[PDB]
Design a protein around this nucleic acid. Structure first.
Ligand code: ANP
Ligand code: ANP
Ligand code: MN
Ligand code: MN
Ligand code: MN
Ligand code: ZN
Ligand code: ZN
Ligand code: ZN
Lengths: 159, 286, 771, 278, 284
RNA sequence: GUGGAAAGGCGGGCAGAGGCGGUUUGC
RNA sequence: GCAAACCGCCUCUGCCCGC
């Protein structure tokens, strides 16, 4: 019933809002299918919004405190300020983004391990593609995906 | 026939799509400014013994629009015989109501063939509100002023037939002066300004005893099918009396019109452009 | 006279049908129709009802046999008491008999009048009084004899106190016999009035044509062009009325529509009172467009060309090529009225005549002969209101500001605009009389006030069928007009600056314009003159009569529930500039114009049996925009909702992507479904929002900025997650749940998103809270 | 009589935000192109703000310009609003609908006034046209390519109104242009008389100097103005140019010069070829 | 009636946020709750003209409210005002000093032109009104960062921070945290106030009345929760200049320049006002 | 020999009031 | 041997006035 409620593009946005062990594997195999999507610059279409609904649904069932993610959300913010005719190289700052991402999972101790497990599992294979990459492209598709994770985090009852 | 399409590429909003009486008033003010009084009389004598200009018509990116001839409203049962009656009524109602046609559909409308309308008119009549402010107390006084706001690649153009030395000596210097001053409207607000390009238009018009006018004509005899246009403008502050033109698309028969002179109390005499721009057309039985 | 006895012959011969449905005597209503008129001649009547009972007894061919049973009864009943001859009174019965078949082209039951729009739905019997009763064609009920017994009782009262004369009996029969069927059959949609109004029209036009009793007996009057269909239309009405400047705040502009309708009646009644015809010969007169059946004599063709000459040459002197009246005529025969074989002949003669109206409007003032010839006239100026070129010296100071030098034909309309509450019609007399405000092409009209005695040979009375204080030697012409208007604390018409200061929300002017769609195709299904006359009054009565009864707040169960911001008040600030024909133009407060657009059109869905629709254009403007600009926009917006799926009502000026997939006009069933969901979650009633959303409009104002990212390009999906975040932190996950996710089926159906069709429910409710 | 058309080109730099309203999801929209939605500065909003600033400049110097300009002797400093009659002895003589504005009523008086000679008058049986043409300043192509790239060009700023006693807040929203937006302006002076054309340029460049320290449109006193003119090139376009089309007009060069570097710091040094052809 | 022009007294300098500054907007997906306003082009915070011109007016209307028996002998149209507000009786114009309902607040704005010509508040900040409408004489422009705080933004220093505050429930000792972005203390903006000299009779007072409101602003706060630390603004003046009428016609540097580059805002309204503005009085 | 000539969508309005990064006990 | 339970926004306002 959990994989049947998660169709290709958008089966139900408010249907999953009213809905533990059902999507404990159905969303996680889809998060592994999101982890199978190693090329971030592979889906200009609705698939980014289709993934990020299923990405943020597996994490809203766990904690995923936004105030701990804001160290990365302001890291994607201040470097998007560097996109708007400020710099041309975020190579010295995506490593700083990945340094604080290890500091993100390295600080949150307690019951927020499996929430930060999939948060470590999804972003970092896309960031390794972003290592030797341009920044005007392959990052806009990443950051529009990065906005869509937090946007459905609040819609399904997070904070 | 082969004409010369004088394109006008706008540098702002117009006040109205110009007409043939307010292009010849604008050209005659241009020749009186850069040549003098002795060349305006040579200009009026060239439109009598020679060829003339048409009204201004819109375009949109090498799709030249031309007015729908009035020859097709009595024909409109016979034009659309090959259409089923569930939509033949409303096809002919949007076709009788139309105002402009493409260059291919104009050449079909001259021969009484099935043609289509355009979906996008290249401008809009927008109401920009202005205000009047006191210089001491900043007191507002709103009034409403309407403009013609064109699209990205669109503009207006008119046609010219005649000899070349009349064009290259009078009309071609007039359009470079009139690009920096305006064509009607509040030209001190940067309204009637444009750039100019000279091109080549070819129109397939059939040969018959009837013809359609592509300009305001002021006919001498009575035309065959017409659409009245009652206007009269201004001339150096003096007001022109309203005169009964016929709009473009009207059908005349061996009728050249005639430029009428007026007095108006000025030093010179004021000519109102009453000549026609004929292209052949096919009619029904009346 | 045989003239007044033929017109009152065919009009008063099919009477006797409603006493057969009531059962007052032994049947075969030609027998009872004689014994109803002959009974009326006894008690409080003259001896001419004794002779008008011959017409109601020698038709349907049941008595006119062997040409001798007619003589034995008309011998003792003496025509010598009046002036008629034995040959003459026998001649008029054959004229009425032939005219009965020329208007129908065709039992023993009691079956109602079926609707001309749906033949499967029928009308209950009602009065034509335009109060409390919208006749909605419902389930077919056999009308009881207790209802026809009360029809005859009200009719017996009214025929006695009315003068035996054609202009006095036509409003009597129009009140009572409107919703009575002519021939009691299955799906008969011809009214009994419109079969008697069109039998007396053909019968008098046969007498004027000169055909006699042997031209009827031998069939000579059929297959010979002895009839003549007059049809006339005004061209330039939209440029005539609304093209005025920022003067005359809605009292003048409402008097432009009343003065144009007086030009219409001054030409129609000039044809009737000069060809010898009656008002029954008018098939219809609906919206600057009329149709008259006349006679085909060379004395009439010579006189119609002089009526057309003097009317056009009048219009050009007064209205400088702003309004034209094309009048045409087409000779038809007796077989032309009825359907022959399977090919309709009456719609064919109506298309031959409509083609002559088309080719004459393309020759706009050809019969002037000084039209394209110039002329030196000195010292001319323009009226500041309407912009007509007059020689100054004819200009004069107005009554509003004495500095403004207006033309004399617009000081007569500001005064007439001030008397529209205090006006029960007009009196039509000669040009050079006292008391004449406005002048038509043939006759001057005097204002018939509330109190006073009228003057005029023909007295037009508005919105009633009752000659109250009219002299007994004058002609009564009843005409209807939609005359609802908001009043100020004074008695006069409200103002553009006063209607828009009682709108629940921001200050805008509400201007609507809408007409019946594909109506000319419906009028081609009519195959007789009586069926055309039935179909052209009921559509005319909706805009003439059944549009004031909507704004008064009636029709509660038939309309039901509509998109309403505030509840429907007892005094709606709504001004009907015009309604009539098929179109209406109504201004008012923009929060009640919007409700009335879905309240008129829901009432039109039940007036017709669902088979005809409206299409409404809507605009929201400033008060200080002039009405020549607030009409050219809505007429463009009316045509915008008409070159589309045609059932569509434009609502608000909306931006949309340039792909061609999106359309600016809501369909009617689409938008009304989008009100039942979206309104009870963000709106509560009377200008206020819901709970847990009070002072939270920063959601809803910025929600349109989310939608404007969709308008730039629908190829982006950025509006989908931005919707879910802004609804998220406010706790409003239940409100608007189908706006966060995209619709996968909609792209497969190639239709716009639900974020596209949510603008016109938000934007109306946004601006109807204080804004 | 016609001699040429002095063409002034350059850029308008919105150093602070820009509001020019229309009153039609922001409660106060700015004007926009009806087809694309790009904002623009009109010609009416830029000519009437040059005229308003220059009429106040002449109002303070009526008695001091009596000998360079005639028809300033007919006027007294002040408005005609208390003594409610048009064309009276005061300076703001014409009433349009509610406001009083200096417009000279005669051809031979507007030809001697410094305001109505340049900005034009209306008259009764006079109708003196103006000499400058102020085009609509649209966004430059550096800023339309930023518009196509998904950036925003107009923000939404939420001010408030606060009671001095209870501190009740009452907010509204004002859309204005993002600070920094380059425009492209255009002013075409029309040389009718060859004597007083130095005066009509030094008066036009004076009203641009006033406009840099004043505001253009919107609230302004709350910081919705701060316009700054960056000139690009001047032209002359002589009478010989329009007859034959051969490109030998006089081009004065100011690639990056101010409105103060152009008015006396270059006025003889740049227009020396323009003065030589008269 | 009789609006003139003599010059534009331009007051420049630098706004110095000694404690953290906060001027907020309404809501980007991830970010700090209650955000500071920002320039949409450069992505940096700033101070509006509206948040500075209205704040100087709000501190000055209250100071005139407390003296309606000392300014009124020097300023007419203060006999029409009795101290207090129109909050009890919901009329616009009565004898109370705060005589306009803006939407729900009461703000002293004079109703007419010739009434506002003699008010000490509304001759400087301007007014509105039916049939007569007195515009302002000062214009306040938006204060962006200085040039030395663009470099610190490019170097990577935090121009803002995120202070977290807790509204403690009194009985249960329950926390309730939320975040507040604030411009970091020591950050330095650049203000711009331009007084428009229209009458040479009364400009001595309108400069002193403008510096009166500035001296009240260094003692009060500017934006945000300034009763909890978020204010403490300080003015560092650069250049009092005059810009006479002959400046805009010639274009040479004919402007009178008063130099007080290292002085205090109360050290300009101090006795020595008529010494620093001695050359301005010689030009009128 | 231009349905023309002249006309600032403008004046006044603080995103502000209130609020200790805290307490509870153990796993 | 050392940390985790909970708390992440609450409630007021939201265009007036003039042509
Ligand atoms: N007195 C009136 N006031 C307002 N509208 C009216 C009045 N009388 C008629 N109308 C309506 O105005 C509409 C417009 O008429 P008209 O200007 O002739 O347009 P049109 O008939 O479609 N053009 P054309 O084909 O040349 O006649 C008519 O169809 C009537 O329904
Ligand atoms: N009540 C009426 N009785 C008879 N004729 C009418 C009536 N109302 C309108 N007409 C005429 O019928 C025609 C309807 O024209 P029009 O208003 O264009 O609608 P249409 O032809 O059906 N096309 P549409 O625009 O979709 O309504 C016109 O010639 C009107 O004058
Ligand atoms: Mn018509
Ligand atoms: Mn219709
Ligand atoms: Mn219609
Ligand atoms: Zn008039
Ligand atoms: Zn002047
Ligand atoms: Zn005051």
């Amino acid at each position: 019933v959990d994989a049947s409620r998660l169709f290709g593009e958008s089966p139900d946005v408010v249907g999953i809002k009213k809905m533990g062990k059902q999507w404990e594997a159905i969303q996680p195999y889809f998060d592994n299918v999101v982890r199978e999507a190693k090329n971030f610059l592979e889906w200009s279409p609705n698939k980014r919004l289709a993934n990020a609904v299923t990405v943020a649904a597996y994490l809203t069932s766990q904690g995923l405190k936004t105030n701990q993610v804001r160290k990365i959300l302001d890291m994607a913010r201040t470097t998007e300020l560097k996109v708007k005719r400020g710099e041309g190289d975020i190579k010295d700052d995506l490593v700083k983004m990945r340094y604080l991402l290890a500091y993100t999972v390295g600080k949150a101790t307690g019951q927020s391990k499996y929430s930060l497990d999939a948060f470590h599992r999804i972003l970092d294979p896309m960031l390794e593609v972003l290592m030797g990459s341009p920044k005007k492209e392959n990052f806009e598709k990443f950051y529009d995906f990065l906005q869509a994770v937090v946007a459905y985090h609040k819609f399904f009852g997070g904070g | 026939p082969k004409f010369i399409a004088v394109k006008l590429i706008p540098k702002g909003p117009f006040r109205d799509i110009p007409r043939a009486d307010t292009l010849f008033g604008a050209i005659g003010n241009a020749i009186s400014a850069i040549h003098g009084q002795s060349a305006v009389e040579e200009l009026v004598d060239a439109f009598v013994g020679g060829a003339r200009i048409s009204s201004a018509f819109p375009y949109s990116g090498d799709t030249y629009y031309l007015p729908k001839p009035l020859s097709v409203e009595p024909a409109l049962e016979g034009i659309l015989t090959g259409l089923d009656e569930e939509e033949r009524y409303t096809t002919a109602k949007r076709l009788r109501k139309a105002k402009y046609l493409d260059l291919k559909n104009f050449e079909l409308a001259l021969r009484l063939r099935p043609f289509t309308i355009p979906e996008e008119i290249p401008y809009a009549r927008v109401d920009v509100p202005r205000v009047v402010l006191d210089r001491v107390t900043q007191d507002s006084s709103i009034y409403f002023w309407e403009e013609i706001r064109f699209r990205e690649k669109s503009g207006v153009y008119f046609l010219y037939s005649g000899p070349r030395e009349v064009f290259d000596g009078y009309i071609a210097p007039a359009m470079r002066f009139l690009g920096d001053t305006g064509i009607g409207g509040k030209s001190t607000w940067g309204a009637g300004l444009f750039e100019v390009e000279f091109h080549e238009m070819k129109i397939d018009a059939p040969g018959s005893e009837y013809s359609v006018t592509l300009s305001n004509a002021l006919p001498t005899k009575t035309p065959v099918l017409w659409r009245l246009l009652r206007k009269g403008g201004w001339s150096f502050g003096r007001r022109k009396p309203r005169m009964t033109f016929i709009a473009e698309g009207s059908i005349v028969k061996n009728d050249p019109g005639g430029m009428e002179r007026l007095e108006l109390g000025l030093s010179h005499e004021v000519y109102v452009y009453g000549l026609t721009f004929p292209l052949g057309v096919e009619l029904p039985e009346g | 006279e045989i003239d007044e006895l033929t017109a009152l012959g065919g009009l008063l011969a099919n009477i006797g049908k409603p006493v057969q449905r009531a059962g007052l005597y032994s049947g075969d209503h030609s027998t009872q129709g004689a014994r109803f008129l002959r009974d009326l001649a006894e008690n409080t009547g003259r001896a001419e009802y004794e002779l008008l009972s011959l017409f109601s007894e020698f038709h349907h061919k049941g008595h006119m046999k062997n040409d001798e049973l007619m003589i034995r009864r008309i011998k003792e009943l003496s025509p010598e008491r009046f002036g008629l001859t034995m040959e003459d009174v026998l001649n008029a019965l054959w004229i009425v008999y032939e005219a009965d078949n020329l208007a129908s082209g065709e039992p023993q039951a009691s079956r109602p009048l079926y609707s001309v729009f749906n033949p499967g739905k029928a009308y209950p019997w009602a009065e034509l009084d335009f109060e409390k009763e919208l006749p909605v064609p419902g389930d077919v009920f056999s009308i009881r004899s207790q209802d026809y017994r009360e029809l005859v009782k009200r009719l017996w009262e009214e025929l006695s106190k009315a003068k035996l004369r054609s202009d006095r009996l036509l409003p009597v029969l129009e009140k009572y016999l409107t919703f009575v069927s002519s021939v009691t059959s299955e799906g008969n949609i011809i009214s009994l009035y419109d079969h008697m109004r069109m039998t007396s029209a053909i019968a008098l036009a046969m007498l004027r044509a000169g055909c006699t009793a042997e031209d009827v007996r031998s069939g000579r009057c059929r297959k010979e062009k002895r009839f003549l269909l007059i049809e006339g239309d005004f061209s330039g009405i939209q440029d005539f009325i609304y093209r005025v400047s920022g003067k005359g705040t809605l009292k003048y502009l409402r008097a432009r529509s009343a003065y144009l309708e007086l030009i219409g009646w001054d030409v129609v009644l000039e044809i009737l009172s000069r060809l010898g015809l009656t008002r029954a010969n008018v098939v219809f007169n609906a919206g600057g467009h009329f149709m008259i059946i006349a006679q085909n004599t060379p004395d009439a063709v010579k006189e119609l060309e002089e009526i057309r000459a003097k009317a056009v040459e009048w219009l050009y002197r007064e209205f400088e090529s702003d309004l034209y009246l094309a009048i045409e005529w087409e000779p038809v025969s007796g077989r032309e009225f009825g359907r022959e074989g399977g090919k309709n002949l009456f719609a064919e003669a109506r298309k031959r005549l409509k083609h002559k109206l088309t080719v004459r409007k393309l020759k706009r003032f050809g019969e002037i002969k000084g039209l394209f010839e110039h002329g030196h006239t000195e010292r001319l100026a323009e009226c500041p209101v309407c912009g007509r070129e007059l020689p100054e010296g004819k200009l004069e100071p107005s009554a509003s500001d004495p500095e403004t030098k207006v033309c004399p034909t617009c000081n007569r309309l500001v005064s007439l605009g001030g008397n529209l509450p205090k006006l029960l019609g007009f009196g039509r007399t000669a040009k050079n009389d006292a008391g004449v405000l406005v002048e038509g092409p043939f006759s001057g009209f005097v204002p018939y006030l509330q109190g006073g005695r009228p003057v005029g040979e023909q007295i037009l009375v508005k919105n009633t069928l009752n000659p109250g204080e009219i002299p007994e030697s004058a002609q009564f012409v009843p005409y209807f007009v939609a005359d609802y208007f908001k009043k100020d604390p004074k008695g006069g018409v409200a103002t553009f600056e006063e209607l828009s200061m009682a709108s629940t929300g921001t200050r805008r002017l509400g201007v609507m314009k809408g007409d019946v769609d594909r109506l000319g195709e419906f009028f081609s299904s009519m195959d007789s003159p009586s069926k055309l006359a039935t179909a052209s009054r009921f559509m005319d009565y909706f805009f003439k009569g059944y549009i004031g009864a909507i704004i008064e707040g009636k029709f509660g169960y038939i309309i039901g529930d509509v998109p309403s911001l505030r509840d429907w008040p007892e005094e709606p600030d709504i001004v009907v500039v015009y309604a009539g024909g098929d179109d209406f133009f109504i201004v008012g407060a923009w929060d009640q114009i919007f409700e009335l657009a879905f309240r008129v059109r829901r009432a039109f869905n039940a007036y017709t049996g669902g088979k005809l629709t409206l299409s409404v254009g809507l605009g929201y403007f400033d008060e200080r925009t002039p009405i020549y600009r607030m009409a050219d926009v809505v007429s463009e917006r009316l045509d915008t909702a008409k070159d589309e799926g045609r059932n569509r009502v434009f609502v608000v000026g909306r931006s949309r992507p340039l792909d061609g997939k999106h359309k600016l006009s809501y369909e009617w069933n689409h938008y009304e479904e989008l009100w039942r969901t979206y309104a009870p979650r963000i709106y509560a009633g009377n200008g206020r929002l819901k709970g847990k959303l009070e002072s939270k409009k920063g959601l809803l104002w910025k929600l349109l900025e989310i939608r404007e990212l969709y308008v730039r390009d629908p190829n982006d999906v950025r509006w989908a997650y931005l919707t879910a975040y802004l609804l998220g932190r406010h706790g409003l996950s239940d409100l608007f749940p189908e706006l966060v996710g995209i619709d996968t089926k909609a792209v497969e159906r190639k239709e716009p998103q639900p974020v596209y069709w949510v603008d016109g429910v938000l934007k109306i409710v946004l601006m109807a809270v204080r804004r | 009589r016609f001699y040429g058309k002095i063409v002034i080109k350059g850029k308008i730099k919105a150093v602070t935000g820009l509001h020019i309203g229309s009153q039609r999801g922001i409660d106060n929209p700015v004007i926009k192109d009806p087809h694309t939605g790009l904002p623009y500065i009109p010609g009416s909003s830029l000519k009437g703000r040059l005229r308003s600033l220059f009429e106040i400049l002449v109002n303070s110097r009526l008695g001091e310009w009596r000998e360079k300009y005639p028809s300033l002797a007919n006027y007294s400093p002040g408005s005609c609003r208390p003594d409610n009659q048009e064309n009276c002895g005061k300076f703001f003589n014409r009433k349009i609908n509610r406001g009083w504005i200096h417009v000279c009523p005669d051809y031979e008086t507007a030809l001697a006034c410094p305001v109505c000679r340049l900005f034009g008058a209306s008259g009764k049986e006079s109708n003196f046209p103006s000499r400058i043409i102020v085009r609509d300043a649209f966004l430059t192509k550096e800023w339309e390519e930023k518009w196509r790239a998904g950036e925003a060009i107009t923000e939404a700023k939420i001010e408030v109104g606060i009671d001095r006693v209870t501190s009740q807040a009452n907010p509204r929203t004002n859309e204005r242009v993002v600070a920094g937006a380059e425009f492209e302006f255009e002013i075409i002076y029309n040389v009718e008389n060859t004597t007083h054309w130095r005066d009509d340029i030094k008066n036009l460049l004076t009203a641009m100097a006033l406009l840099e320290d004043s505001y253009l449109g919107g609230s302004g006193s709350r910081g919705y103005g701060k316009v700054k003119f960056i000139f690009d090139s001047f032209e002359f376009r002589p009478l010989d140019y329009y007859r034959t089309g051969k490109d030998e007009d006089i081009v004065s060069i100011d690639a990056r010069e101010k409105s103060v570097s152009d008015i006396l710091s270059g006025f003889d040094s740049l227009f020396s070829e323009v003065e030589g052809k008269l």
